[PDB]
């Protein structure tokens, strides 16, 4: 699946 | 209930300790306790809430996918399905908890654009996770709930925040993933990612070095998705 | 109680699924359920029990150390100590659960040397973890409980198993760590590791390729500790 | 702290 936002 | 007797400041302090200890379930419980004190969250506190729950649900989602894949390859007795169901219910429970915090009463009390967009982004993300495991008709209403949250957030962000704002960028990244992975709308996904990237590029000149670093990090993740999708 | 209604075979099947999903808390609960069915465990089942609890307590121990270090550097209010205490109690609880399974009734029903050594090694390891967090006098009796378990295991292993047996090797590795880290006995640690390594080396010629691989892996970990300690 | 046995 496509990557979404990681943690900062 | 469970954190009702602990000071708000102590809850936040312990959430930070739990983050350092990689105890994300504890972190999430502490931050839920803090939200239930009824006061608005600061910027740092919102980030703690988000980090906590993203780690918890991220583990659950990863486990769900492992189990779902084994289940699909099986198509032995009921065990794989049962255990997949167990993890799925636990995941749905966490999502409902987060959505319940947003609805009681974080979104309604959020007046500043940054806080409101942050919470509506979260609301989209957690309906998106619910969508990943949903089957059939509830699936449609879940998907529309995600879409509606993201769209409201996008409309506020476009009016009130610069194109380089990290929250705005992250929202666009996640909404583009929603389009590609959930809504069966890859062209919308690609469009959104490209337009977001281009509008941010054009505003980089306004940024200090530290802001530039954050904006460009997210821009690179948009580009990475565009590369994967084209 | 909680797994009382599930078939033993289903518990084992689900433990394996939980391992694949990296859901070690679930894995441990499944394996506890399986132990509580009252039958002896096979070799594979013993390994599942051990993997499950090692992962659970390993997370707890890592968190405890992070918190203990922050606490020591503080020497603010009671929060760091409180949260360290919370993690410590949870850890002690897991250790007590494992020790309770070994005592009710895995060790007593274990007649074959391999099973008995396996369980006594576990008993040493979990008293060792309790020792890591203990302070003062209970500390001494905990340390002696670990020592006694390891020593019984060593005596059986020396009489009944080849020097290359992975369980025998692992026991020696962990007992040597006990000596170095818990008992303040670095010379005993070094002696044990060296003698174990040398006696295994001398027996490698007897092994098939697959057994050789396993024995030599552990031998390398003994050597790695000897390097660190000298 | 010194490494103990890892999982197989
Ligand atoms: C959803 C969201 C977007 C942005 C941030 N955020 C705030 C400050 N820095 C960031 C950031 C920067 C880079 C990366 C890769 C992620 C996040 C937080 C959040 Br929850
Ligand atoms: C305590 C213990 C020792 C050995 C094993 N084990 C059984 C089969 N293979 C192993 C092994 C091999 C190599 C390494 C590095 C570890 C374990 C299990 C256990 Br619980």
The angle at the Cα of B39, spanning B35 to B42, to the nearest 5 degrees, equals 80
Nearest to B10 among C14, C66, C79 (CB): C79
SS3 C107: helix
Give the ligand with the smallest distance to the CA of C157.
2
Nearest to B196 by CA among B160, B164, B161: B164
Chain C's closest residue to B68, CA to CA, is C21
Chain B: give the shortest CA distance to residue C184, in Å.
27
Nearest to D2 among C51, C218, C228 (CB): C228
Q: Are C58 and C25 in contact (CB under 8 A)?
A: no
CB-side neighbour CA atoms (13 Å) of D3: 14
Chain B: give the shortest CA distance to residue A6, in Å.
9
Chain B: give the shortest CA distance to residue A5, in Å.
6
| E strands, B94-163, in order | none
Instruction: Report yes or no: B146 at the C interface, CB cutoff 8 Å.
Output: no
Among B19, B128, B166, say which to mutate for ligand 1: greatest number of ligand atoms within 8 Å of CB. Answer: B166
SS3 C150: helix
Within 10 A of B51 (CB to CB), how many other CB atoms are there?
A: 18
SS3 D4: coil
Residues on chain B touching C67 (C-beta within 8 angstroms) = 17, 20-21
What Å distances lie between residue C124 and B4, C115, C143, C145, CA to CA?
A: 40, 14, 9, 7
Instruction: Report yes or no: C8 at the B interface, CB cutoff 8 Å.
Output: no
Q: What is the CA radius of gyration of chain B?
A: 19
* Tokens encoding B162: 């610069």
Q: Are the Cβ atoms of C83 and B59 closer than 8 angstroms?
A: no
Method by which the coordinates were obtained: X-ray
Residue nearest to atom 9 of ligand 1 (CA): A8
What Å distances lie between residue B146 and B193, C20, C194, CA to CA?
A: 18, 30, 61
* Torsion region of D7: left, alpha or beta (phi above 0 gives left; psi -120 to 50 gives alpha): beta
Chain C: give the shortest CA distance to residue B63, in Å.
5
**With the CA atoms of B58, B59, B64 and B67 taken in that order, what torsion angle do they form, in degrees rounded to the nearest 10?**
150
CB-side neighbour CA atoms (13 Å) of C39: 11
B neighbours by CB contacts (3+ pairs under 8 Å): A, C
Residues on chain D touching C45 (C-beta within 8 angstroms) = none
Q: How many residues does chain A have?
A: 8
D neighbours by CB contacts (3+ pairs under 8 Å): C
Q: Are B178 and B146 in contact (CB under 8 A)?
A: yes
Q: Which residues contact B12 (CB under 8 A, 6 or more apart)?
A: B30, B31, B34, B45, B48
DSSP state of B78: S
DSSP state of B103: I
How many CB contacts within 8 angstroms connect chain C with chain D? 28
Touching pair B, C by Cβ (3+ pairs < 8 Å): yes
d(CA C183, CA C179) in angstroms, rounded, equals 5
SS3 D6: coil
What Å distances lie between residue C226 and C102, C153, C180, C216, CA to CA?
A: 31, 22, 11, 15
Within 10 A of C137 (CB to CB), how many other CB atoms are there?
A: 8
Burial class (CB in 10 A: 0-12, 13-18, 19+), C90: middle
Chain B's closest residue to C23, CA to CA, is B63
DSSP string covering A1-8, please?
Answer: --------
Instruction: Report yes or no: B63 at the C interface, CB cutoff 8 Å.
Output: yes
Give the ligand with the smallest distance to the CA of B125.
1
Q: Are the Cβ atoms of C180 and D7 closer than 8 angstroms?
A: no
Q: What is the CA radius of gyration of chain C?
A: 19
Residues on chain B touching C79 (C-beta within 8 angstroms) = 10, 13-14, 17
Within 10 A of B144 (CB to CB), how many other CB atoms are there?
A: 13
| E strands, C71-141, in order | none
Q: Are B33 and B10 in contact (CB under 8 A)?
A: no
Q: Are the Cβ atoms of D5 and C55 closer than 8 angstroms?
A: no
Among C114, C218, C220, C223, say which to mutate for ligand 2: greatest number of ligand atoms within 8 Å of CB. Answer: C218
């Amino acid at each position: 699946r496509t990557p979404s936002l990681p943690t900062p | 209930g469970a954190m009702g007797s602990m000071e708000r400041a102590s809850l936040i302090q312990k959430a930070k300790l739990a983050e350092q200890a990689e105890r994300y379930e504890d972190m999430a419980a502490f931050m839920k306790g803090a939200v239930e004190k009824g006061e608005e969250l600061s910027c740092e506190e919102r980030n703690l809430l988000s980090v906590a729950y993203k780690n918890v649900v991220g583990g659950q989602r990863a486990a769900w996918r492992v189990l779902s894949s084994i289940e699909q390859k099986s198509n032995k007795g009921p065990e794989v399905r049962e255990y997949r169901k167990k993890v799925e219910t636990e995941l749905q429970g966490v999502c409902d908890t987060v959505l319940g915090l947003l609805d009681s009463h974080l979104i309604k009390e959020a007046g500043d654009a940054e806080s409101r967009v942050f919470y509506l982004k979260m609301k989209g993300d957690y309906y998106r996770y619910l969508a990943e495991v949903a089957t059939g008709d509830d699936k449609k209403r879940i998907i529309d709930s995600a879409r509606s949250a993201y769209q409201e957030a996008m409309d506020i962000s476009k009016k009130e925040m610069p194109p380089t704002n990290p929250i705005r960028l992250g929202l666009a990244l996640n909404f583009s993933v929603f389009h590609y992975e959930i809504a069966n709308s890859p062209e919308e996904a690609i469009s959104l990612a490209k337009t977001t990237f281009d509008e941010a590029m054009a505003d980089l000149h306004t940024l200090s070095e530290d802001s530039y670093k954050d904006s460009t990090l997210i821009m690179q993740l948009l580009r990475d998705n565009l590369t994967l999708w084209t």
